[PDB]
DNA sequence: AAGTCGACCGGTGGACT
DNA sequence: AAGTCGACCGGTGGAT
């Protein structure tokens, strides 16, 4: 559970178990002996949990202590089990602990978004927890989807055909004179929900914890979408980063970039909004780094003039990503025509 | 020395060998057992040695075990004096290999500068080693400065005066509407010689090694161009990264489209040249990558587009790495008047 | 399927203050 | 100084 319990513990069937043991099924060219099980571990910790939506000591809690929780959960089995003899290197914990955040965080995001559509499609604002009702107009036209996007997306598969095909012949041209513009991807995109799927109960259930079939609900999600979003339709990109180093803080700054330049540039969209969640700034320049104008727009005669990334965000708590992101979409949604 | 010598590491006064024991004097927080003394490794594994400007057989040796030397020498030490005991994290060999890649690949450049200001002050070609002789016609005011740039370093710094101001208006106006253009900095930067300093010998100067002395000479040289550099004088930006990871290749990228955007749009310079070296490009996927246009280059659609990034290089040898920035001066100097 | 690729970030040694 | 600030990259768990 949230809380560490040997009982829950010991009732785990052993690939349930947070910690598994390779030492006697090596990786090949690895060194590994114990594996730090992220799926288990989100079951484990997070099961019957998405902070925000969950008891009011953890929607309250420090968002780094939530956030940290799998990993700590995971040690204390692994110490548990194996004593002295258990043993994860630094760049085990980097790597899951990453993970955590961006995945805990979109499920937050998740069930924002099936409150905000129950309430877009005519339901009541539901109240537990409780967080200011929008003062925005419902309409079914006003719903989102929060994607999570997988390792090596390209976010242009998520646009309708029509607009593919003006980058995809724009890059054409680029090629032929020995250039390119690759798109990567941000870790999370909000969408404006397709008109085919703004009666479907899928986007406005909030889920109660981030089990196995959740996991799988929500990092497939993106999948419905491919094909069927317009560029206007792109309402938010999120970049997770649990910590930040200077050398670390450009890659959401540049997708930021060539996101604005192919849909204010090349395919007519507003603003895109664009910005970094952290939990560790390490100081005070990472946020004059995201100050920066977005570049395409500072040419005469081209897209508006705007910061490429919209804010550099430390969520202090659950509840607070919560408010802030229904916040949001009562602005970013008053674009779109009910 | 670059082989290992059991004698010479017994010569060594404690505070010069390459591994410091702080076992009894631990970092603050931290639980560092034996600390990896980078500056030391430098002077005991290059204190006699430039490679590229060496015997033939470290002129021509793998690149990566000439800057792999260093650790595996102060892992050997390491292991000598003190046995099953001696450990390093990961992460500790992270940070002084890319140092080292950098700090050593700079040192091969800056004798490449050497030579070249040598060849274009009339001193003739220096034959040992062998390298192809420049065509371009020799000119003092062809010559070069080699810059290993500091941390928090501004590259705009560089500019005269005069320069710095057009930027700064710039900014001061992006400032006004809540926005900015900060810039940071490659690892490396190469600059015409300013007229002031075309017959001071010092930039004509080969070092022998990278003794203690001769890494603050050229970690300090970029002090005494700093305000002194025209906007089309800055022919070359350098990245070094040992490795690459996906998310790791946004920084030199980013950077090149800021400075093509100031220097170029905002200076008039000539178009900016920027690469990244690495040893280790894991796949074609980084070579794609760095094969993007120009967004400012995009942004102002002029008759010519070029790209960010001029190459993603893989140094196979030391010498090699010479030859082809000697090869790259012979060309680009070409855009300076004799 | 399971394997090959994606992308995750934290502990480090040195310069500046 | 010892404390504070930059920027280095390598080992990881899993997703058509
Ligand atoms: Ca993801
Ligand atoms: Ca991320
Ligand atoms: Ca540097
Ligand atoms: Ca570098």
Chains 1, 2 share one sequence.
Request: hydrophobic residues 40%; neutral net charge; charged residues 25%.
């Amino acid at each position: 559970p949230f809380t560490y319990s040997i009982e829950a513990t010991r009732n785990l069937a052993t690939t349930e178990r947070c910690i598994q043991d390779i030492r006697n099924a090596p990786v090949r060219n690895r060194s590994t002996q114990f594996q730090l099980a992220q799926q288990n571990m989100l079951a484990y910790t997070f099961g019957e949990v998405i902070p925000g939506f969950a008891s009011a000591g953890i929607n309250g809690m420090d968002y780094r202590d939530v956030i940290g929780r799998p990993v700590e959960n995971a040690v204390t089995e692994g110490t548990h089990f194996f004593r002295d003899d258990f043993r994860v290197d630094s760049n085990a914990k980097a790597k899951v602990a990453g993970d955590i955040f961006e995945i805990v965080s979109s499920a937050v995001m998740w069930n924002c978004a099936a409150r905000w559509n129950s309430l877009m499609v005519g339901e009541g604002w539901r109240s537990q927890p409780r967080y200011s009702r929008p003062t925005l107009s419902p309409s079914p036209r006003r719903q989102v989807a929060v994607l999570n996007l997988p390792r090596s997306f390209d976010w242009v598969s998520l646009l309708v055909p029509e607009s593919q095909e003006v980058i995809e012949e724009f890059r054409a041209g680029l090629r032929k004179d020995g250039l390119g513009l690759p798109t990567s991807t941000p870790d999370l995109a909000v969408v404006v929900l397709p008109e085919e799927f703004q009666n479907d109960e899928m986007w406005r259930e909030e889920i109660a914890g981030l089990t196995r079939p959740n996991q799988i609900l929500l990092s497939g999600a993106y999948q419905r979408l491919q094909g069927r979003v317009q560029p206007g339709e792109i309402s938010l990109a999120v970049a997770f980063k649990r910590s930040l180093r200077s050398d670390r803080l450009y890659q959401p700054l540049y997708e930021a970039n060539v996101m604005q330049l192919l849909l204010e540039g090349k395919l007519g969209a507003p603003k895109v909004e664009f910005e970094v969640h952290t939990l560790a700034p390490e100081g005070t320049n990472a946020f004059v780094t995201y100050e920066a104008a977005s570049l395409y727009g500072l040419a005469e005669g081209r897209s508006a003039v705007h910061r490429a990334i919209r804010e550099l965000y430390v969520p202090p708590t659950a509840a607070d990503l919560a408010r802030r992101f229904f916040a949001f979409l009562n602005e970013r949604m008053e674009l779109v025509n009910g």
